[PDB]
Amino acid sequence: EKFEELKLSQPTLKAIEKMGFTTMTSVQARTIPPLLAGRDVLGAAKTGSGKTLAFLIPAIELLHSLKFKPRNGTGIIVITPTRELALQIFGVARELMEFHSQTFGIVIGGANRRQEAEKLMKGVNMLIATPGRLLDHLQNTKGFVFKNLKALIIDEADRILEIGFEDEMRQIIKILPNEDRQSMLFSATQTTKVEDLARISLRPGPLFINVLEQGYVVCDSDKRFLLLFSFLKRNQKKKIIVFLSSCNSVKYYAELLNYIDLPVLELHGKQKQQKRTNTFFEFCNAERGILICTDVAARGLDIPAVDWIIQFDPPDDPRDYIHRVGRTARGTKGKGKSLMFLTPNELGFLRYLKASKVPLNEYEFPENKIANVQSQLEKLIKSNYYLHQTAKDGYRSYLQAYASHSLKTVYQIDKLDLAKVAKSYGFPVPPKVNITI
RNA sequence: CCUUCGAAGAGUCGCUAAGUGGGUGGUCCAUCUAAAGCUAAUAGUCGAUCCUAAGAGAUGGGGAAGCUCCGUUUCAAAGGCCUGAUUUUAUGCAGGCC
């Protein structure tokens, strides 16, 4: 099960060697060879099990063999349920086409409408997108060539139907071509709707592959980051993993904490694969330090034994988060204590904690022990252009990931005070972010 | 190449507007972007000269596409003269008459 075993192109091998992957795992060892044959796959691998390369490499190989050009339109369409996971997949795909001549693009909710439209206008050979914006771009943009679709990939069909995109998926299937298209579906679990969607999107008979309490802290939106900094500074000697909603917020927090003399490591989907591997390998043997990473980037990774796991931002998949508080304790034999920051408006999440029957513990913090570095942070943001831009980007990404959360009954953006949210990023007045509120 | 953004001519279009608007065509579609602009291929002494007469006619103002016309003191800032120890926070004109 090695990459050199399979007959592939030269740029593909160059990119794979650059990312550092040599020994492919089982999921990408029992699916890629059938995929180069041109059949259809209904997989069941969990997210982060290496299936990303498994469904990517055939797409790049097909585009290379067919020798696509920008004026040929799109040839590969990947459909993902969440905004942040599509960014990770797009970041992975940017490195498999470093030397190839094809074109890659991203279409997700909350992004620039006209910029995405123009990127489609120029001709994008591989599009990674969310179901909601795909319908808009298909039914509204003129000049988006998609009649030359050669393959289609669905990721986390269970998540897509759970969020409520089944009508959108049906309309998308009714729009996209069907004859030359050889399709692909992946889903960790499978309910009736999963094969209901699989039947109308796959050729008949496709091959299928089979693979301790929790704490919380109630904090105000203008004091979340400052309290987090206080806690991290007070607990530097321990091992802490901090989860954030987006990659831009992860990088901004890491850079800021390193600028204020607090050493932290960072993981996000906009970094190199080798950089991510190096940092995660470093974190697993240092027995000290703080790692800040996104929720999705820490899904496939096997979390080591750490002293604290903080969920600073709302979880991407609360259904998985409720189970993980017991799953990681089943795996890790150490007392890895969990913490979750909740604002007063989104305090209803505790219901899902109570209903799912998990023990619940509340933590207090004195108001006058907070770091009192707000003035320094605001003075630094007004002075350093680079830090100002990174803070604005993190604010943008946090709002964009908060707006499109599946749990609309809990995480509603209309009840979020944007002034206080931007206060925690060092902004007196909120920067303007184009979000439907 | 990547990323974040991304205005558009009103007494005008048609009494009097609009912004995924608007203009013009085709048996829903096609095509442009007005209400802004540039761009080659014998006398001091006798008369006049001075004065005003009926009237004509500038200025102020108004009409008319204009050559020009009306109106003659009119809702014009329409000009002369005089006085003074040199003018009281220190030598930058004050007052009066018609």
Scanning every strand, the nucleotide with its C1' closest to A70's CA turns out to be B1
Q: What are the binding residues of A for ATP?
A: 45-52
Residues near chain B strand, CB within 7 A? A 103, 106, 111-112, 114-115, 118-119, 393, 396, 432-434
Scanning every strand, the nucleotide with its C1' closest to A432's CA turns out to be B5
Distance A280 CA to B70 C1' (A): 101
Scanning every strand, the nucleotide with its C1' closest to A114's CA turns out to be B6
One-letter amino acid of A230: S
10 Å CB burial of residue A173 (0-12, 13-18, 19+) is middle
> Which residues sit opposite A186 in a β-bridge?
A43
Distance A388 CA to B78 C1' (A): 70
Reference A137, options A91, A184, A175; nearest CA is A175
Q: Are A214 and A338 in contact (CB under 8 A)?
A: yes
Scanning every strand, the nucleotide with its C1' closest to A122's CA turns out to be B1
Q: What are the binding residues of A?
A: 45-52
Tokens matching residue A122: 């120029």
Distance A329 CA to B61 C1' (A): 102
Q: Are strands A337-342 and A207-208 parallel, antiparallel or unpaired?
A: unpaired
Distance A136 CA to B20 C1' (A): 14
Tokens matching residue A198: 């699989």
Angle between helices A166-175 and A131-140 (to 10 degrees): 40
Chain B nucleotides with an atom closer than 7 Å to a protein C-beta: 2-6
Gap between the terminal Cα atoms of chain A: 50
Using DSSP's 3-state secondary structure scheme, residue A61 falls into: helix
Q: Which helix (H) or strand (E) holds A308?
A: strand A308-311
Tokens 């599509």, residue located: A86
Taking the C1' atom of B1, which residue's CA lies nearest?
A103
Residues 6+ apart with CB under 8 A from A240: A232, A290, A291, A306, A307, A308, A309, A310
Using DSSP's 3-state secondary structure scheme, residue A335 falls into: coil
Distance, CA of A152 to CA of A41 (rounded, Å)? 11
CA dihedral A97, A144, A85, A45 (to 10 degrees): -80
Resolution in A: 3.0
Tokens matching residue A158: 């269970």
Residues 6+ apart with CB under 8 A from A268: A247, A248, A250, A251, A293, A294, A297
| CA distance readout (Å), A113 to A57, A126, A135, A246 | 29, 18, 13, 20
Distance A74 CA to B24 C1' (A): 36
Taking the C1' atom of B5, which residue's CA lies nearest?
A112
One-letter amino acid of A299: R
Q: Which helix (H) or strand (E) holds A58?
A: helix A51-66
Q: Are A62 and A102 in contact (CB under 8 A)?
A: no
The 10 Å Cβ neighbour count of residue A92 is 16
Distance A166 CA to B34 C1' (A): 47
> Which residues sit opposite A185 in a β-bridge?
A42, A154
State the method: cryo-EM
| CA distance readout (Å), A202 to A177, A218, A388 | 12, 47, 48
Residues 6+ apart with CB under 8 A from A431: A392, A395, A396, A422
